[PDB]
């Protein structure tokens, strides 16, 4: 007398050899695992990189006075970056947002004179704002140029800036931003540090960011009421909305953003040059590294259930532990294999529960049904 664990595959449509919602990159898509406690099950996933999807690129720019000269090179980005990425895709959409800081003390001055011109009176700075969605995602590249050229610099008091409030809003206000179900790149270009959760106590803001949308007239209305997001909050909302993040920061702060990049799963970081001269090349190099890389991630597992990952990439690279969730140097059309060993220890739930496996940046998901035998 001995019941044993089993595997069987329910949905196994082959990888595609053509809109992105119809393209298949991972197979099998659904399977059922019969688990006896202590015994592992082991299925393999095949990933084949499809040809480049369309691209929605949102440019979220630090708009402090240190960034004034940077505007004139980004002011031509709409047409330039589209012509520069024809090779990758001709279905390109671009948008623009801008941020400075929370509008309370001590992060800014609130004296009426500084509340209308935070910088020195010579400089014609506008009043400070938290986050403004200037131009929602569109292919009107020339419209991006005209609007960015018309954008007004401003400033604040302390050097670390509240870009985290803007990222959260960009990630979770999809209906206002206009994210399509395609490649979502979020470029975050600053030249200063960042505030994070817990810093808001100095401004009288202790309530944690609620991860909801609070844009009215394309401006963030509640930077006074919610703390800065935690990194965990940002990672949760960023990945849940398939936002691949590109940190274009200056060399002075690139160490902290390389550390931040390592905490965010689908993120690259490049070093911004002097006047944002090299940001077109910076993006496509960051795009080349994000698109030529696949990282799986699984949903919430009932406790008692272990999951292992082992990867087999091009040129014999074999990853284990948490690096078995990832493969790199993968070109278009390349295929790589993942081995997923999951183990249960209890008879935890009475009936079947399912979680899902997905590559980051895509809406594609592998559904894995779990059945415990007992």
């Amino acid at each position, epitope marked *: 007398e001995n019941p044993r664990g089993s595997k069987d595959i329910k949905k196994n449509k082959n990888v595609t050899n053509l809109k992105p919602e119809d393209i298949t990159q991972i197979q099998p898509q659904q399977l059922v695992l019969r688990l006896r406690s202590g015994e592992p099950q082991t299925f393999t996933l095949k990933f084949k990189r499809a040809e480049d999807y369309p691209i929605d690129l949102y440019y979220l720019m630090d708009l402090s006075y240190s960034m004034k000269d940077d505007l004139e090179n980004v002011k031509s980005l709409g047409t330039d970056l589209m012509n520069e990425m024809r090779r990758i895709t001709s279905d390109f959409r671009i948008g623009f947002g801008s941020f400075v800081e929370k509008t309370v003390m001590p992060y800014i001055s609130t004296t009426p004179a500084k509340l209308r011109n935070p910088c020195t009176s010579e400089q014609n700075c506008t009043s400070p704002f938290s986050y403004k969605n*200037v131009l929602s995602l569109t292919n009107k590249g020339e419209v991006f140029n005209e609007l960015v050229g018309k954008q007004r610099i401003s400033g604040n008091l302390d050097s670390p800036e509240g870009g985290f409030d803007a990222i959260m809003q960009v990630a979770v206000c999809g209906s206002l931003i206009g994210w399509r179900n395609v490649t979502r790149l979020l470029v975050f270009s600053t030249d200063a540090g960042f505030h994070f959760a817990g810093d808001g106590k100095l401004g009288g803001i202790v309530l944690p960011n609620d991860g909801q949308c609070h844009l009215e007239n394309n401006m963030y209305t509640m930077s006074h009421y919610y703390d800065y997001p935690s990194i965990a909050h940002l990672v949760q909302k960023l990945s849940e909305n398939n936002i691949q993040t590109i940190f274009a920061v200056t060399e002075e702060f690139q160490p902290v953003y390389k550390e931040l990049k390592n905490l965010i799963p689908k993120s690259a970081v490049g070093t911004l040059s002097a006047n944002s001269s090299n940001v077109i090349q910076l993006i496509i190099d960051a795009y080349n590294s994000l698109s030529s890389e696949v990282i799986l991630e699984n949903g919430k597992l009932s406790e008692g259930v272990t999951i292992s990952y082992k990867s087999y990439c091009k040129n014999g690279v074999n990853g284990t532990g948490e690096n078995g969730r990832k493969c790199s140097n993968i070109s278009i059309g390349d295929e790589v294999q993942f081995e997923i060993s999951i183990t249960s220890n209890k008879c935890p739930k009475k009936d079947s529960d399912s979680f899902k496996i997905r590559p980051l940046g895509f809406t594609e998901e592998v559904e894995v049904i779990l059945q415990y035998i007992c």
Partner: antibody
Amino acid sequence: DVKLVESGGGLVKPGGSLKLSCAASGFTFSSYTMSWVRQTPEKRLEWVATISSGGSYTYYPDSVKGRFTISRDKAKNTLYLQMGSLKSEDTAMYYCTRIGYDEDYAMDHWGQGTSVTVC
Amino acid sequence: QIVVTQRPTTMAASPGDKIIITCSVSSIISSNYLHWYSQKPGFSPKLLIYRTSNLASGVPPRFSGSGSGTSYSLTIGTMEAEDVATYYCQQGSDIPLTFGDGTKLDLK
């Protein structure tokens, strides 16, 4: 306040030419993006051309590219649509519209429309 | 090209009747880029709703707009007899700018 007044429509022979004009009053002409939308006998709206506030860039649907050409005169407060190599598909009432914000491209004011018939 | 699909093509209602018209686009657009127009017969179109839910100046409170992603809707809270017209939705997100075929709302 805002008034848009189209004129220049008429009867044209296929492959011929027509030039339409919209005189803008009641608002600063150079601050806004102007465009031409036409309504066909099947009562359908077809966007025909758009030009920036400074005239530095223009957009056309591919059905009219090369035939039509949109322009504006900053000094006369009038927008033009020069039509060429015409056809029975171009038979429509042509409206002059203003775009209030380039961030949404809603046409907040429409002229009264000039009629073009093509045989 | 973004295809805008408007339904119903025609609708017949009575004063005190509550119209709900829908507008669907082939690809996701931001809610800032979907607008509604109305056209009384014998006149030109006039902006009715812009950015999905913002009433244009001079539009009565009974009109309302809603939606996101690809499905948007325009509702007339209680129809008045003057509301007889044809209603268009427009996407301004992408070049080319495309218009729905219009819902013609009439009487009985």
